[PDB]
Amino acid sequence: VEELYVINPINQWPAPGSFSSQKPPGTLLPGEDPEAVFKQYHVVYLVPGAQYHWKNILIEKPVWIYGNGATVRTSGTGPILRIVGNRTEKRDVRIQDISFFGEDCTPNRMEPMSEKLVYQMAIWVTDMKRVTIKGCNFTNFAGAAVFFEETAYNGFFWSMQHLITECRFTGCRIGIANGGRSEYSTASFNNFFDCQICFNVVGGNWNRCGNIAANCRCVYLHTTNMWYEGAGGNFNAAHGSFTGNTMNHCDYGGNLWPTAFQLPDREIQLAGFYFDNARARCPTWTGNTQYYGDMKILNFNQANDAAIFVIDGCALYGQPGDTGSIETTAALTDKVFIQGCQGNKVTLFNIKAANVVPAIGTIKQKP
C-alpha cells in the first residue's frame, strides 16, 4: 500500500512505444463524435444516466444503441440521428432506452406549421429495414418525432418490419410520421400527450393496437398532399389497422392546440379522426375509446361499392353541443355504418338512423 520497490535511473535512451488504446470496449462517452464509433462497432452502449448532445448523426450500417437511461439533446435545424440504408443489410437497428429532447421547452403551439419546422425530427430512417424504437421518451419537437421514409421498391417486397413500442410523446407537433410505401409495420402502446397530430399517416397497412392519445387535437390524419411524404409519396395509402386505442379529449376538456394546421397546399380544420382521400380506403376501427373526440369522414373510395366505413365496438360520448361529434359528407351517408357502439348523446352529422345499431346519439344534418 506504499510501493517501496527500488528504481534505477533512466539511461537517456529513446523510450519504447507505450500506447493506451482500447479504452472503450464498445461504449460511447459524452463529448465524443458518434459517427466514428457507429462505423466501427455493431452494438454501442451508452453511459448510464449521461447527458449527450447530438446533431445530424449519419448512420449507414445497422447498429444497436443501448441507451441505459441516456439523454440526447440537440440544437439546430438538422434532425437527430439520420439513418440512411441500402437494400442489402441483413442486420437490424434497435434504438432503445434513450430520452430524446428537443430545442424547446413548453413548445410554441401557436406557431403555424411551415417549411422551416419540417426538419425538426429525432429519427429519420431513409430506407433502412427492420428498425426498432423501444422504450423511448420524445419531448418538445416542433416537427415530427419519427419519420419513416421509403423509396420506390418493386417485386412485392413489402418486408420492412418496423416496431415502435412503449414510447412517450409529449409536446411533439407530429408524433409517428411515415412516408409513402412504408408498409406493414406496427406502432402500439405509445402514450401520446399534448400533441397536435399523433399519426401523420401516408403509408398504409400499419397496425396500431393499444396507443393512448390524451389531450391531443388529432390522432389520425390522412388527406391529399400532407407534410412528411418523402420520396415515393402518397401511393397505396391508408390501409392499416386501428384497434383498441384511446383518443379522449380531442375537442373539449384539456386540449391546447389550435384547429388549423396549414398543409403545404391549403389549411384544414383538424378533428380527432380526419380523413379525406378519394383514392384510399378506410382502416379497421374496433375497440377505440372516444371522449369528446371529433370524427370527420370526408371522402374515401366508395365509387363502385368498393369501401364501407364501419365503426364497431367503440365509445363516442360527447354531450355538450357539438363536442365529440361525427361529421360525414352528405354524399357518403350510405357508406358510413356504426354497428356496435356506446355513446352518451352525440351529434351525428349526415348519418342515417337505420345505419347505426344500437340507436344512440343525436342525428343532425350539416349541409
Binding site: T77, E115, K116, V118, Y119
Partner: protein
Amino acid sequence: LDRGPSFKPYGGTAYNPLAPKSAPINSAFTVGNDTHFVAQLPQTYAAGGTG
C-alpha cells in the same frame, strides 16, 4: 525557419476587432429551402413612387 500554422503572435483578432462577436455580415444563406437574406442598408437615395 518555418513556424507552421500553430503560430499567432498576438491576442484577439485583426479583422473587424470592434464588432460584437455574435454580429453577422450582410449575407445570404441556403438553410433548408429558403435563402435567408440578412443585411444593413446605410445609403438611402430616391424612388418616391414605385422603386
